[PDB]
């Protein structure tokens, strides 16, 4: 199917406590593969997936070097933003950055991203054409002017369509057994009596990959959206994911309900019924 590579960067200022915390992580699809933590002793980019561990010292020296340059940039940005918004020196603030690429089933480039957020809200974002910038306020517009004059979009576009895609493909190849696998959900249903007039019917999806899934309840064929308890898709901790949907069913209506499951690993969508 389709694939993506993402790097996520979080920079948090710590007033009167020295240098800001800086955390970097990289994902291929829903699999983390690298990290960097400024508060760690190593001070190096580190493997977080088995298939990247034996990439040579040249790889790790290079990623370590570049991520440190990322760190130094963010540290300055915190100050610059502190000024753009006339904020105090005693307040803690968060800068976030995300960039990466999407490819299709044919591993060909679909989309590129590069965007920043200041204290949890959009600040500046590269548009889909990878040629223009979205800035909301005056501060962001100022940054946008800097970046137009330094032709930032052009260099970013090169990476996004080039090395980003190029190296996403390599990771997919190297980690084939894991990154190119499709674990169809293991599904089951539980039934528990909340009282003597009602029972909880819960539909489970377990040990599936990737994370994207559709989990729905129907009563005699009609959607039960607002009457369905639906949890966020969650990691099992072993590289697979879980999710469940539940409905309160009145006495003797179990046969009316159907649980519906859609996932990359299932040829045809599953229909489950308590019976």
């Amino acid at each position: 199917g389709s694939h993506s590579m993402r790097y996520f960067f979080t920079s948090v200022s710590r007033p009167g406590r020295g240098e800001p915390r800086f955390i970097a992580v990289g994902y291929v699809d829903d699999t983390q593969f690298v990290r960097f933590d400024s508060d760690a002793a190593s001070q190096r980019m580190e493997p977080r997936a088995p298939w990247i561990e034996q990439e040579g010292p040249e790889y790790w020296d290079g990623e370590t070097r570049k991520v440190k340059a990322h760190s130094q940039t963010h540290r300055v940005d915190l100050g610059t933003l502190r000024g753009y918004y006339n904020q105090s020196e005693a307040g803690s603030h968060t800068v976030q950055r995300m960039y990466g690429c999407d490819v299709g089933s044919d591993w060909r480039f679909l989309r590129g991203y590069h965007q920043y957020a200041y204290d949890g809200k959009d600040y500046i974002a590269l548009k889909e054409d990878l040629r223009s910038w979205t800035a909301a306020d005056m501060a962001a517009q100022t940054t946008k002017h800097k970046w137009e004059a330094a032709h930032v979009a052009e260099q970013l576009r090169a990476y996004l369509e080039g090395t980003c895609v190029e190296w996403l493909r390599r990771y997919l190849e190297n980690g084939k057994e894991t990154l190119q696998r499709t674990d169809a959900p293991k599904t089951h249903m539980t039934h528990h009596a909340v009282s003597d007039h009602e029972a909880t019917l819960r539909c489970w999806a377990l040990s599936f990959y990737p994370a994207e899934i559709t989990l729905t309840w129907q009563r005699d064929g009609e959607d039960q959206t607002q009457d369905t308890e639906l949890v966020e898709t969650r990691p099992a901790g072993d590289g697979t994911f879980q999710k469940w949907a539940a409905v309160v069913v009145p006495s003797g209506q179990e046969q009316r309900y159907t649980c519906h499951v859609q996932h990359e690993g299932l040829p045809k969508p599953l229909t489950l019924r308590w019976e």
């Binding site: 996520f8 979080t10 948090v12 955390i23 992580v25 994902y27 983390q32 990290r35 933590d37 977080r48 803690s92 603030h93 968060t94 976030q96 995300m98 957020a117 204290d119 949890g120 809200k121 959009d122 539980t190 528990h192 819960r202 377990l206 949890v231 966020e232 969650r234 990691p235 099992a236 901790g237 072993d238 879980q242 469940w244």
Partner: protein, 100 residues
């Protein structure tokens, strides 16, 4: 400035079977800022050998973390996740239900 309260899920890696090895998970997501305290509790007492994933965030900029530890479920033993964050007037305690 923006403050988003963490959603909390406590759950096991594998379906719970008494006497069998497993991992107790507490997944906190959709929060902002990133400072957050998360403890795993066994019969009301903090578990000390608890690991967590590396800080990451969703498309909407809100953060998520997975806290986890090895455990062997049991009929009598109760487990829970205790979470504290600026959006919380008091630490939120969610009990582990083997059916959720």
């Amino acid at each position: 400035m923006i403050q988003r309260t963490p959603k909390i899920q406590v759950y096991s890696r594998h379906p719970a079977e008494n006497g069998k090895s497993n991992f107790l998970n507490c997944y906190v997501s959709g929060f902002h800022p990133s400072d957050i305290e998360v403890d795993l509790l066994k019969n009301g007492e903090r578990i000390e050998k608890v690991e967590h994933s590396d800080l990451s965030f969703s498309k909407d900029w809100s953060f998520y973390l997975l806290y986890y530890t090895e455990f062997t479920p049991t009929e009598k033993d109760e487990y829970a996740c205790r979470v504290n964050h600026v959006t919380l007037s008091q630490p939120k305690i969610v009990k582990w239900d083997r059916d959720m």
